[PDB]
Design a protein around this motif. Structure first.
Motif, mmCIF file in Angstrom:
data_model
loop_
_atom_site.group_PDB
_atom_site.id
_atom_site.type_symbol
_atom_site.label_atom_id
_atom_site.label_comp_id
_atom_site.label_asym_id
_atom_site.label_seq_id
_atom_site.Cartn_x
_atom_site.Cartn_y
_atom_site.Cartn_z
ATOM 1 N N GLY A 181 22.732 13.080 10.816
ATOM 2 C CA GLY A 181 22.926 13.547 9.459
ATOM 3 C C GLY A 181 21.657 13.931 8.734
ATOM 4 N N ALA A 182 20.517 13.932 9.418
ATOM 5 C CA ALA A 182 19.238 14.228 8.794
ATOM 6 C C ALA A 182 18.998 15.731 8.744
ATOM 7 N N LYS A 183 18.527 16.210 7.593
ATOM 8 C CA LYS A 183 18.252 17.632 7.419
ATOM 9 C C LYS A 183 17.106 18.061 8.331
ATOM 10 N N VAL A 184 17.378 19.030 9.205
ATOM 11 C CA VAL A 184 16.342 19.663 10.005
ATOM 12 C C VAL A 184 16.000 21.066 9.508
ATOM 13 N N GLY A 185 16.920 21.744 8.824
ATOM 14 C CA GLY A 185 16.653 23.034 8.230
ATOM 15 C C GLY A 185 17.066 23.060 6.772
ATOM 16 N N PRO A 186 16.332 23.814 5.945
ATOM 17 C CA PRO A 186 16.497 23.695 4.489
ATOM 18 C C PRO A 186 17.789 24.293 3.953
ATOM 19 N N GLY A 187 18.094 25.519 4.350
ATOM 20 C CA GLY A 187 19.224 26.220 3.785
ATOM 21 C C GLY A 187 18.829 27.042 2.577
ATOM 22 N N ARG A 188 19.855 27.492 1.858
ATOM 23 C CA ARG A 188 19.694 28.391 0.726
ATOM 24 C C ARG A 188 20.130 27.683 -0.546
ATOM 25 N N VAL A 189 19.297 27.761 -1.583
ATOM 26 C CA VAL A 189 19.683 27.260 -2.895
ATOM 27 C C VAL A 189 20.771 28.157 -3.472
ATOM 28 N N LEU A 190 21.858 27.541 -3.943
ATOM 29 C CA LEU A 190 22.924 28.278 -4.609
ATOM 30 C C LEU A 190 22.693 28.279 -6.115
ATOM 31 N N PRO A 191 22.998 29.381 -6.797
ATOM 32 C CA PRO A 191 22.790 29.414 -8.250
ATOM 33 C C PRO A 191 23.815 28.538 -8.954
ATOM 34 N N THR A 192 23.327 27.632 -9.797
ATOM 35 C CA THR A 192 24.178 26.696 -10.530
ATOM 36 C C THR A 192 23.721 26.670 -11.982
ATOM 37 N N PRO A 193 24.060 27.698 -12.765
ATOM 38 C CA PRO A 193 23.653 27.687 -14.183
ATOM 39 C C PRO A 193 24.225 26.529 -14.987
ATOM 40 N N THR A 194 25.419 26.038 -14.647
ATOM 41 C CA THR A 194 26.053 24.940 -15.365
ATOM 42 C C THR A 194 26.564 23.886 -14.388
ATOM 43 N N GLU A 195 26.806 22.679 -14.914
ATOM 44 C CA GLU A 195 27.468 21.645 -14.122
ATOM 45 C C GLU A 195 28.769 22.158 -13.516
ATOM 46 N N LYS A 196 29.547 22.921 -14.291
ATOM 47 C CA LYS A 196 30.820 23.429 -13.788
ATOM 48 C C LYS A 196 30.636 24.227 -12.503
ATOM 49 N N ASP A 197 29.515 24.934 -12.373
ATOM 50 C CA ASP A 197 29.262 25.707 -11.163
ATOM 51 C C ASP A 197 29.080 24.815 -9.942
ATOM 52 N N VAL A 198 28.506 23.622 -10.116
ATOM 53 C CA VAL A 198 28.345 22.715 -8.983
ATOM 54 C C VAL A 198 29.706 22.270 -8.471
ATOM 55 N N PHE A 199 30.568 21.815 -9.380
ATOM 56 C CA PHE A 199 31.930 21.462 -9.003
ATOM 57 C C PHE A 199 32.623 22.634 -8.318
ATOM 58 N N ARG A 200 32.576 23.813 -8.946
ATOM 59 C CA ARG A 200 33.239 24.992 -8.399
ATOM 60 C C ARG A 200 32.823 25.241 -6.957
ATOM 61 N N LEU A 201 31.513 25.311 -6.714
ATOM 62 C CA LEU A 201 31.016 25.631 -5.382
ATOM 63 C C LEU A 201 31.383 24.563 -4.366
ATOM 64 N N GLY A 228 34.295 23.147 -4.451
ATOM 65 C CA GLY A 228 35.745 23.145 -4.411
ATOM 66 C C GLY A 228 36.396 22.042 -5.215
ATOM 67 N N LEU A 229 35.736 21.563 -6.274
ATOM 68 C CA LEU A 229 36.252 20.455 -7.062
ATOM 69 C C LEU A 229 36.593 20.899 -8.480
ATOM 70 N N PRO A 230 37.612 20.301 -9.096
ATOM 71 C CA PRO A 230 37.833 20.529 -10.527
ATOM 72 C C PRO A 230 36.739 19.853 -11.337
ATOM 73 N N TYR A 231 36.378 20.488 -12.448
ATOM 74 C CA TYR A 231 35.314 19.954 -13.285
ATOM 75 C C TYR A 231 35.733 18.610 -13.866
ATOM 76 N N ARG A 232 34.785 17.682 -13.918
ATOM 77 C CA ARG A 232 34.986 16.376 -14.532
ATOM 78 C C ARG A 232 33.988 16.226 -15.669
ATOM 79 N N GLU A 233 34.494 15.967 -16.878
ATOM 80 C CA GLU A 233 33.621 15.684 -18.004
ATOM 81 C C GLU A 233 32.862 14.388 -17.730
ATOM 82 N N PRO A 234 31.709 14.199 -18.366
ATOM 83 C CA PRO A 234 30.915 12.990 -18.080
ATOM 84 C C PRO A 234 31.712 11.697 -18.126
ATOM 85 N N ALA A 235 32.657 11.576 -19.062
ATOM 86 C CA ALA A 235 33.425 10.341 -19.189
ATOM 87 C C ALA A 235 34.278 10.068 -17.954
#
Ligand SMILES: [Mg+2]
Ligand code: NA
Ligand code: NA
Ligand code: NA
Ligand code: NA
Length: 320
Positions: free
Chosen positions: A287-307, A309-316
């Motif tokens: 499970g150890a990273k041997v290659g870096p990969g590509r940074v995906l653009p994530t302007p907002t928290e919602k984009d991280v969830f989206r990419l 495949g998760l529904p957005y969760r508010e901090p609470a």
DNA sequence: CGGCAGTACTG
DNA sequence: CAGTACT
DNA sequence: GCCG
């Protein structure tokens, strides 16, 4: 919690394994306890127990002993050292290895530590604030601390954005500490600000001790003015604006939530950190990273969830 | 069998 | 590096 | 400790 009579006994074992250094077993217990705390109904059967993710044969067996006998015999054989190891590892900057070493060397009390142990600079500050650091503060005081940092930051550059994360942002009524994230929308003017910011917060006596002074992270101690005030732990992180969403996500947590999200990303050939969400991440058999990969653009928290495949969760809804 | 999250800081 | 810490 |  439908299963207090079970988890209260399990927490004791979990803590014992933890302070003794058995970190993976302690992890297993912690996950079983959360799962148990989240079940809808009391667990009444072995087979019901095994049906819960996070509960295996060994743990169902323990739950069965509790229901039938109201007790867990393993509790009677916890080492006599555990209360002392817990006492010692509640010193900020001392963990299981230092606690065990002090125990082996014959120390049994904080008086022993004070008078005879060799302490790191961090551990001496932790000892000086031992009681205070074990207390939580009202949400309202975390607001005052966040505003103190923001006012000092904005004095230098009014464009600086400061947000309290951690339990504060998850909406909790009390906070163990205050976690302040700072960035600047122009993507450049976050740089080099600690020297001036920290110096400013020292000037009027707000910042009382420094534990960690890195290029990106500060960890220290503050105290608001006036009577009736306790010393509080304060963390500050300064990040470039391109990393704001992942930094916000990381520093809002919870810790279990972050670990769960990061494990999910790993299953999808991705990697999530406080710096970025990355795709096409190359790993090895461990499970150890041997290659870096590509940074995906994530302007907002919602984009991280989206990419992911998760529904957005508010901090609470992240208070796992 | 073997991972169990990913990273920053200290000395 | 090992240890500790952060979420 | 649990799980793939
Ligand atoms: Mg916090
Ligand atoms: Na299960
Ligand atoms: Na500690
Ligand atoms: Na002594
Ligand atoms: Na913190």
């Amino acid at each position: 919690n439908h299963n207090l009579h079970i988890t209260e006994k399990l927490e004791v074992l979990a803590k014992a394994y933890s302070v003794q250094g058995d970190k993976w077993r302690a992890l297993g217990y912690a996950k079983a306890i959360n799962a148990l705390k989240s079940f809808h109904k009391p667990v009444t059967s072995y087979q019901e127990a095994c049906s819960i993710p996070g509960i295996g044969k060994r743990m169902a067996e323990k739950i069965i002993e509790i229901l039938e006998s109201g007790h867990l015999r393993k509790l009677d054989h916890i080492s006599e050292s555990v209360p002392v190891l817990e006492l010692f590892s509640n010193i900020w900057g001392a963990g299981t290895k230092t606690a065990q070493m002090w125990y082996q060397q014959g120390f049994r009390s904080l008086e022993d530590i004070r008078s005879q142990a060799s302490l790191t600079t961090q551990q001496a500050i932790g000892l000086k604030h031992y009681s205070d650091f074990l207390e939580r503060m009202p949400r309202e005081e975390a607001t005052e601390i966040e505003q103190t940092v923001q006012k000092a930051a904005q004095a230098f550059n009014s464009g600086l954005l400061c947000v309290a994360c951690g339990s504060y942002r998850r909406g909790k009524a009390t906070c163990g500490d205050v976690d302040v994230l700072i960035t600047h929308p122009d993507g450049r003017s976050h740089r080099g600000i600690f020297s001036r910011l920290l110096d400013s917060l020292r000037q009027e006596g707000f910042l009382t001790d420094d534990l960690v002074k890195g290029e990106t992270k500060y960890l220290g101690v503050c105290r608001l003015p006036g009577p009736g005030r306790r010393h509080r732990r304060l963390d500050i992180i300064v990040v470039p604006y391109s990393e704001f969403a992942c930094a916000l996500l990381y520093f809002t947590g919870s810790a279990h939530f972050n670990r769960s999200m990061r494990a999910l990303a790993k299953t999808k050939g991705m990697s999530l950190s406080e710096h970025a969400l990355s795709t096409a991440v190359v790993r090895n058999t461990h499970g150890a990273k041997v290659g870096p990969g590509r940074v995906l653009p994530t302007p907002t928290e919602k984009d991280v969830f989206r990419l992911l495949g998760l529904p957005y969760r508010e901090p609470a809804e992240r208070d796992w």
